């Protein structure tokens, strides 16, 4: 059958050490475990035996009690451990007070469901899953190693510290890996990370599984350099063997969780590729006295340990003819000169085994005096020993570990602990080692970043998209995970608000340089410069001087018959109208202000009114004089209107236009409004509407029609130096100009300026072609 | 400690069958169950014993080899799971084990089974999670999954349209999985589960009382209790029912466990009535009953509990045996047997059928391994149920109930339930009566036998439907169970049971709020109340105009009427007559031909019928223009002659131009106006802006002729025809102007327009034309 190591004693404590290897996938119903594991196996078994010798040899710790122990392998498998636990239970009814936990996590769960029923305590020295920390489904489980809830924090801390946010996660099958991922993935997706794709694999999978798993892990090759391997010991060995088989040459930075640890086993022989691997590991101080004891142990005196012979056969690949287990498959023989100090390595999680054994011993020590303090040993109270009373003693007991740190069990049945962020490098020529490169204690991630990455060119940040935050280029989500954001620019008026909002700045403002904020775009207008404004004001000045000259002539020459014959006051009216029309641009272009904003309307409307009204009335009177004299039969109506009625009718014809202007001014208050052709530019002009300008325009258009009709009715008339012979052309010109005005004004983009030119043309065509003629007549 | 009735044999097969009642609350750690299960334990142990002896004594099943057995009393629960595992873990011989009573009592056993490959067939477990073979590989059963039970429960609660239910349940894998399935597959369809109270089977009086008081909190709302209540839970709830003395005010509804059993209802004759109770179909086994009746305490000693079982059954004592139990005062005489008050347990045939299932699987393995030898050859020396379970996977054979046994992939024998109740046959003897049968999704109950009156139990309904015509249901914030039903808008029809939408302008929702409809418009046509006198007025105006036209054209030769003009008068006649034409053309159903005709009329009619008057007044003023001054006035020509016709035509062309312009702007078409949500009509596209322009031009052309006629007023004309034309024309203008209020002041903006046109016509005729007729009369 299967060999079982035992230690005689009144009280026997169980133990499940992964003495052999995990049974090969080929066939497990035969329960054929694989090879013998040294570090996880024989060292742990000898630790058990030797520490039990120390305990039962210690007078102060469990006096007069020889704690025997039954040691059973477990081959690190769901299968063999269950059968061994069954053999524990069948003999429970010599009794077995408690067992020392199995190696992995899933095996711990499976043994725990069995052993919680029968009040048999268990102490696991390596199981590191959250699910076992629950005290409802696994109410009766205890361990001396902190949960992985304090390890997923370590990984999130590392992956945050080095800016990575796009990584690929491989977790070994079983409860340990699945729980570890369901911790790390959630805890990083919450904080700052987005996992590429969380794979899975079996520890003992075939070479094809790794040969394809490397293909998936290189699928994201230029974006996933951080293999978040939450993996057991053998799985990382599998990926490394795959790297060697396929030829990956260090293109990865592994992150080995716990099962990798500083264990040389996983990478020995082929440690040429794991370089850069950042591997967490529980803080396990070394033990020296046991190390010397084990080193000086030889097969000749080792009989209480049954696996020692084949272990000696394995490590030194030879034969021991002095023992029945000759292992004839080997050719060479083993000599006594060989000693264990040659290439000796001590497993990482070794002090935890002794810590667990000490915890069990101290629980028994507490329970002894919890009932019969006087008696030294197993009194009548504990003859039917009850694990119920031992459970609370374990809950409350707190010894001092061999390393030194005090051990306490919380309500969850675990113990606090720290970590150690080791790392793998290349020191010598073909010589590699696990340098301590940091530490971890309740979030205080300390890492000697200087020791590794001897340059500043560290590993690629492994982010899907570079920090695309340059300038106005903004990041937007691709409709998927935030690893690969879609990065796009914003438009000229579209201002990046905080980090991604491509909002558009308001119509009045402009997004400033470097997309820092919105600035109100400076306004532009016509102050005094530019070619056309100064040209128009010079035009106005010339017209003003000419008009002043003509008015002076006709006021200092009011007696001569060449001009006194025509209505002197009507000429005075037209002169004043032309003067104000010229003056309109003198205030139309200066600067748009509240005060001038209505003077502009005053000019543009009022001026043409009397500029043409006196002309219309004069031409109507002339027509009536001539048309009535065409027949001249009687025509005995000397007065008609005549007299001074011309001045009053001009007053009233001014008054109507004044009223129209007042009505517009009241209905449309004069004030400056900001205008803009496009968003690129902003202007400022008066608030006069599309209706404001044209409100007094018809009153003058019809008046122009009336005067041109009466000029037609006169046309060629023998008068005082034939004024009408030029007034006709003047009216033709003013008609065509005022007709061409509307198309030019509407849709001009230069509405404010063309008013002055239109008024200037209307003024000059009238003045020159109806007043100037008589001026050189004054010369004669 | 626990006593075991060991039966030796060549092949010993294990099993897990309860004997006494469930463990007491304070005796859990003592590992000692309490009172005796009279109808369960002895029945099941005698069942295994008798079927085993009949199987081994029959060469047709496992020939030349005897069959042994070994069990450990479990008393239900996982409390004695310690003892069942103590027996189990023996192993390596074990070739067969049979699943214990409760599902959770067997699930961990199955988990352990999956490791070292021992077969196990259940008979009372029902949980669906056990049907999964991924993690429960070596588990089997001869009863179906609880999914069928849940489906049956949903079917029962929905057939009698119970919706708002208050659902207690038991605990373990039965209650939790059963309630998850029942809730998921019930509340989806129509069911309103109030809550799912949880309670252990052996609970105390206080917990049962508080649970009952929570259940009695919805008395007019949920009068059923959708128990997954186990037998013990029903026991306790009925204890509470009696101690409080509930009047059965809510109708119980048990589950798989509670069954027809007299086990827990007794003493409470009138209470728990109406207990619809799903029970598993199993005919009573024949050869078990007589063999059980043959058992006597002195004759049979191999069964340990059997000796004191008589003292437990009959209130007496056995002096002749060490199991005295002196607590009983009376003594047992030689006049007692098991025939009196006998009851056979319902869940009986499943045990025997499962035992036969495993025996036939073992026989199949026996033939398959070494056909040469019938018995135990060298092949069975390596005891291994791994191949045995694979052999029995496909095994099929007839069951003792006349049916067969087949193990599907899920490993449950197909079956069916019964839906049977509790009623009141006669005074002081109240008995259940099998009143239904459910089968694989095909349902059937004798709804008549249940509720053998008109009165039923109050429907498990939170609120009445209250869908009377329009009152529409709506939620409150809780689950879709209780509705504050409310009617929608009068113009809104119920889109569905909880949605409404307003009808379009065409109409309002029809009767019963079934949907929407279309109102038959309605409009103004020939007939009607008001137009009774309208075309009468129009025809009287026609009579007047025809009379005046015939008298004028018959007296046209005399220059009496030729004093001023001839063509202008004819234009007046034409205009007034066509205005009457307008008032005919209106007040009808508007169509495409009518639409533009309306515009043409109410446009050019007053236009020309007043423009001719304008020109005539112009002519008379021009005649009297020079009379006042008469200085020379040697311009008698001007235009005159026939140029008055030209001036009239050029004057009237503007109105036609504007009319055609608005005709282009507004095409002649008929639209459905909406004066009110209730009613609609049909009318042209004419608007205020459409009508005001021709009316404006006609005002422009009426003002001038008013002014010119007033300038004329009293003149020495032919009989001074101008005396009355202006006198009535002032009224003409005042009525035309004062019309705008009435037109834009009521919904009658066609009949008023017609009356306006008719009046504005008749006033011109009666003044400008009536006197001249009397003139040419004499
Ligand atoms: C990356 O992480 C390190 C850690 O301090 C630090 O440089 C910084 O916070 C992150 N960003 C860059 C650009 O380094
Ligand atoms: C609903 O319940 C009433 C109550 O008497 C019953 O008559 C009817 O058959 C049930 N089913 C339907 C579909 O109405
Ligand atoms: N990480 C594992 C333990 N463990 O896995 C290995 O591969 N070695 C080792 O110690 C767990 O805590 O479940
Ligand atoms: N009550 C259980 C079923 N059940 O009750 C028993 O007593 N045995 C049994 O299988 C349920 O509601 O599902």
GROMACS .gro file of C-alpha atoms in nm, chain B residues 320 340 576 648 700:
model
    5
 1100UNK     CA    1  -4.156  -1.063   2.930
 1120UNK     CA    2  -5.621  -0.222   1.393
 1356UNK     CA    3  -7.505   9.268  -5.802
 1428UNK     CA    4  -6.359  10.090  -6.534
 1480UNK     CA    5  -6.030  10.158  -5.110
   0.00000   0.00000   0.00000
